[PDB]
Amino acid sequence: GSRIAKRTAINKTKKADVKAIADAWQINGEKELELLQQIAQKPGALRILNHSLRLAAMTAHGKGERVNEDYLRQAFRELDLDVDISTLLRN
C-alpha cells in the first residue's frame, strides 16, 4: 500500500526549529550532515519551514544567499518565507 512515512514527525523540532536552520544545511559540512542524519528521515513537518528551508540544499540561490553558517538564514530568511521563496520570483 501507500508508503506514507510517519507524518507529524519531529522536523527540526520546535526548540531546534531555528537552531537547525543554522547547523542544518551548508553551515560546516560535517555538523550539518548530522542534523539531516536524523531530520530528513523524521521531519513530517518541513513544509512549514521548508517553504524557505528547501535552500538548505539549494546552494545556487541566484538572488540573495551568503556563504557560511549565515548563508542558511540568508537563504531561508533573506527573503521572507511566504512568497519570495514560493514558486513566484521572476516577472
UniProtKB/Swiss-Prot annotation:
The record's subcellular location field reads:
Host cytoplasm
Q: Which residues bind DNA?
A: 2-91
Kindly list the residues the record flags as site (Sensor-2): 47
Looking at the UniProt record, the site noted as R-finger sits at 3
Please report what switches on or represses expression of this protein.
Answer: Expressed in the early phase of the viral replicative cycle. Expression of early genes is repressed by viral Repc (latency) and favored by viral Ner protein.
Report the family membership: Belongs to the AAA ATPase family.
What is its quaternary makeup? Homomultimer. Polymerizes in presence of ATP, preferentially on DNA. ATP hydrolysis triggers polymers dissassembly. Interacts with DDE-recombinase A; this interaction stimulates the catalytic activity of the latter as well as the ATPase activity of MuB followed by its dissociation from DNA.
Q: What is known of its domains?
A: The N-terminus region contains a putative DNA-binding region that allows filament-filament interactions and probably favors MuB polymerization and filament clustering. The central region contains the ATPase module. The C-terminus comprises four helices arranged in a loosely packed bundle which can bind to dsDNA.
Describe the task this protein carries out.
Selects the target DNA sites for transposition. Recruits DDE-recombinase A to the target sites and catalytically activates it. Displays non-specific DNA-binding properties. Polymerizes as helical filaments around the DNA. Coating of the DNA by the target DNA activator B might play a role in favoring target-primed replication over integration. Prevents self-integration into an integrated copy of the viral genome.
What is the protein's given name?
ATP-dependent target DNA activator B
Q: Which organism is it from?
A: Escherichia phage Mu
Lineage of producing organism: Viruses, Duplodnaviria, Heunggongvirae, Uroviricota, Caudoviricetes
Shown residues in whole-protein numbering? 223 to 312 of 312
